[PDB]
Amino acid sequence: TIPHLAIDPFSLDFFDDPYPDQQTLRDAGPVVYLDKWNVYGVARYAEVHAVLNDPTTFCSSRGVGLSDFKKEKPWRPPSLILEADPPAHTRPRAVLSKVLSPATMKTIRDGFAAAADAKVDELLQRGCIDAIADLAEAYPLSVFPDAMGLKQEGREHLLPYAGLVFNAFGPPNELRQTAIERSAPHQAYVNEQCQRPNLAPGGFGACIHAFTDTGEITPDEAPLLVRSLLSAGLDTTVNGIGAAVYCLARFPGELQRLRSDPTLARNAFEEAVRFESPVQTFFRTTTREVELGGAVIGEGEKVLMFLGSANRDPRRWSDPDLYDITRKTSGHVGFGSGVHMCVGQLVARLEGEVMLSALARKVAAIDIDGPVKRRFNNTLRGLESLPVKLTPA
Ligand code: HEM
Ligand SMILES: COc1ccc(C(N)=O)cc1
Ligand SMILES: COc1ccc(C(N)=O)cc1
Ligand SMILES: COc1ccc(C(N)=O)cc1
Ligand SMILES: [Cl-]
């Protein structure tokens, strides 16, 4: 039998303090039912991990938002990659995997690192900064659109476009309906930038389009794949980096360990992703009767996965509520898991690593001094403002 809960995981109150409610989602049972949205959810590591890794039973092509694409109209033309199942998922996934490969990362690494080092130097001259606007936002804006091959004009649409995209996975609450209603200028900007002539040579965009020349993808598929990176590639990392800086500020001891060993940079970042989980929730839809958490769920049912909760499940993590930069982070579901596991994870880890490496080397202390402000999103967790004083090494 399946416990009914009145928790609204897409409400402002939940966003503002999700942890007691997430403990309840986990502790009530391995499978729950949410009265407010009439859907099943699993919040424990074991179930979330199991669902991610059985795409046959828990498919994505019926949407990874609440909306069931088999019965409803998608808010936009579906992603070729995020919202598709094997075998169809395979080819577009292969393309983005090549474009965002370890080898590609070697070619851009030095530029990313110098940008990060320069960015921290610049902030140190001011002292009083906003770790969101001046760092978590500024840094990825300075490297990712260039690495994409994007024109300078119209970049201000990138953040709110991703905000839109992630709200749209949500239920039809105010956050979602207001996003979609204000969407047209963002979409129109994005659609211009997805076209072959507008993407600089040597960038992610052009590289994607090159796959049309070999017959690997069509001229129609090409722009939709660029759309994927512009949908998913920025706001996530912004929140990842913001999360890392927030953790180092709240856990001063962990910052000092990072200064003592800056090679901990990449793992400090991974641990921030586990701890805050910029992407909080995704859905799947059952393709058959299936037993999950000891309950039988019927075919065609949406299932809500609490990734951020799974990453804090005491059944899997010791002292889950502590930021520990030497934790074995392997296994966390912040980037998902299985066939859909984040295809841009190397890009994100590169941005986060080089940026925490710069902080590790150049900063002695990070102190919160001012009102902290949260940004609300149906899917993304992160801060709108984080005033900090940086003290130079
Ligand atoms: C901290 C940063 C990031 C986080 C937390 C994150 C999170 C995730 C998660 C949880 C998934 C799984 C989706 C699912 O299972 O349905 C995913 C997939 C994906 N991510 Fe990321 N991501 C990040 C950075 C990036 C970057 C930098 C890019 C592109 C440059 C990117 C592009 C994608 C794409 C295209 C997919 C779809 C993969 C597929 O369906 O095969 N993400 N991401
Ligand atoms: C699958 O193709 C489409 C195309 C457009 C839309 C839309 N604009 O909502 C939804 C689905
Ligand atoms: C246009 O296609 C896509 C693909 C992936 C994503 C994402 N992970 O948010 C968003 C949009
Ligand atoms: C997470 O979603 C968003 C939305 C808008 C902005 C912004 N306007 O800077 C930043 C992030
Ligand atoms: Cl769009």
TrEMBL record:
Cofactor (UniProt): heme
Binding-site residues for heme b, renumbered to this chain: H89, R93, R284, H340, C342
Keywords: Heme, Iron, Metal-binding, Monooxygenase, Oxidoreductase
Organism superkingdom: Bacteria
Gene3D superfamilies: Cytochrome P450
Record PROSITE patterns: CYTOCHROME_P450 (PS00086)
GO molecular function: heme binding; iron ion binding; monooxygenase activity; oxidoreductase activity, acting on paired donors, with incorporation or reduction of molecular oxygen
InterPro entries: Cyt_P450, Cyt_P450_B, Cyt_P450_CS, Cyt_P450_sf
Family from the record: Belongs to the cytochrome P450 family.
Protein name: Cytochrome P450
Provenance organism: Rhodopseudomonas palustris (strain HaA2)
